[PDB]
């Protein structure tokens, strides 16, 4: 089970909110909130954001209190399917959008992370997890790397 927010998660909520409280008053307006949710992966159409604001507002201002943000984002975070993150990551490896992570892709990632890996090391990293044998890593293969079963 996972009924509660872990520490990284509570931290993510705080940081995201902090980024957009521009007058530093523990409240976000509609425009600030729109991007705060985008940051967390929770993009909503204009009217749904507004409907959300109206739902947690006692005194008529298009503002959202941090304490409320924390609750709403909190339940959205708990419902997060960890697989979405894996698949999103796959896109980021696959620069050129071929549906596969090739050695040139992986070399770019390594270099970007500042790692120093010889092409043999990179070739061997693919080889061990390349199941169909085409010398590259497809989406399902990547998911298998980032899993336990």
């Amino acid at each position: 089970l996972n009924s509660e927010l872990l520490e990284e998660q509570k931290q993510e909520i705080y940081e995201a909110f902090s980024l957009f409280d521009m007058n530093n008053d523990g409240f976000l307006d509609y425009h600030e909130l729109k991007v705060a949710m985008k940051a967390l992966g929770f993009e909503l159409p204009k009217r749904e954001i507004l409907d959300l604001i109206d739902e947690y507002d006692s005194e008529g201002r298009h503002l959202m209190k941090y304490d409320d943000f924390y609750i709403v984002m909190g339940e959205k975070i708990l419902k997060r399917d960890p697989l979405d993150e894996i698949k999103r990551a796959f896109q980021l490896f696959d620069d050129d959008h071929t549906g596969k992570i090739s050695i040139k892709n992986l070399r770019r990632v390594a270099k970007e992370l500042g790692e120093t890996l010889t092409d043999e090391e990179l070739r061997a990293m693919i080889e061990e997890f390349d199941l169909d044998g085409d010398g590259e890593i497809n989406e399902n293969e990547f998911i298998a790397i980032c899993t336990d079963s």
Binding site: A16, L19, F20, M22, H31, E32, V35, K38, A39, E85, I86, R88, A89, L92, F93, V109, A110, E112, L113, E115, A124, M125, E128, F129, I145, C146
Partner: peptide
């Protein structure tokens, strides 16, 4: 300004995602 803040944030996140999963890959390797 708001939309720029967002950009910088998403980029650093994308980077930490690539870093984490590259590391996991390399660990199982």
């Amino acid at each position: 300004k708001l939309n720029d803040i967002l950009h910088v944030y998403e980029k650093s996140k994308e980077r930490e995602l690539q870093s984490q999963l590259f590391n996991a890959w390399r660990n199982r390797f």
